[PDB]
Write a protein that binds this ligand. Sequence first.
Ligand SMILES: O=C(O)c1cccc2c1OCO2
Length: 167
Amino acid sequence: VNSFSGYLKLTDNVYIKNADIVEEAKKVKPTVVVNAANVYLKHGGGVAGALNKATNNAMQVESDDYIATNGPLKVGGSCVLSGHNLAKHCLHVVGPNVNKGEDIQLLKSAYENFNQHEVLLAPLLSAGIFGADPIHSLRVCVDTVRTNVYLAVFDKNLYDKLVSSFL
Ligand SMILES: O=C(O)c1cccc2c1OCO2
């Protein structure tokens, strides 16, 4: 049993809810929240800007030190950093950004990072301002992630379309 409430069950391991991932993280304090990161960990907008704002920019300060030491992530890659006030840990995952021309096949590699964690609160990778089709992102998630993933979908309209169209 875990703390997640109000989710619709899609599969054995994937759950979905219409929710602001920031408000959800603040309520649940999950072990792992996933950030929709870029390779520079520049948390300007979308999910990353919202998560970082909720940490009062502490996420960005920590991220800048990580990049100064390690250099940029790979598209499809990840790193584990602090969850600050939102979670124990933040798994920063880089899905391909279609609005930069990145290979959508890298979305499966991105979701494979989730399998290193037993339970996660996450957004749909490469959705929103990363430009991918969220229906596709949900299918890759279901077909890739084997650990227990609680997906937060901010837009109610999109949430209802994802549920209604789910195979
Ligand atoms: O997927 C998004 O575009 C998004 C952007 C910001 C915050 C969020 C989101 O979904 C969960 O909560």
